[PDB]
Each structure stands twice: as structure tokens, then as C-alpha cells.
């Protein structure tokens, strides 16, 4: 049923465009990642991976 909007409406009735981001961060091949520079890989030495 109709969901019309009027500018004269006060708070709590004005339209509220919403975008919700769903994440699935888990042990799986990662495709979306942040802007962190990749460094060279080192073996047989203690590092903060």
C-alpha cells in the first residue's frame, strides 16, 4: 500500500535512505581488502604477519 512522502512531515516520518553492508569475514579466499601495502615475504624468522 502507498508509502507517500511529504516535505511537511516532521522527524521520524521523513524518508531515510539506508544502505546496509553485509560482511562475511572468515577463513576463506579474500577478494575485498583494504589499502595496506604488501611487503616482501620472509621465511624462518619471527615476524608479525
Amino acid at each position: 500500500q502507498s508509502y507517500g512522502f511529504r516535505p511537511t512531515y516532521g522527524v521520524g516520518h521523513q524518508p531515510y535512505r539506508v544502505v546496509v553492508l553485509s560482511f562475511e569475514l572468515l577463513h576463506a579466499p579474500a577478494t575485498v581488502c583494504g589499502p595496506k601495502k604488501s611487503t616482501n615475504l620472509v621465511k624462518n624468522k619471527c615476524v608479525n604477519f
Binding site: 572468515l26 577463513h27 576463506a28 579466499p29
Partner: peptide, 28 residues
């Protein structure tokens, strides 16, 4: 046509992407 059968033991996959060895892990 149509007929019935017994599934035996089958239809088991890897629920998760993590790796295990000599582990008796259980999952729901």
C-alpha cells in the same frame, strides 16, 4: 518411472574452509 534405494553412508562434504589433520572435529 520412480523407485527407492538406501543411501548407505554418503553425502558428506567439508563444512568449513580450514584444514585439519588427524582431527576428530565435529560440526552441526
Amino acid at each position: 518411472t520412480q523407485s527407492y534405494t538406501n543411501s548407505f553412508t554418503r553425502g558428506v562434504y567439508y563444512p568449513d574452509k580450514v584444514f585439519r589433520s588427524s582431527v576428530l572435529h565435529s560440526t552441526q
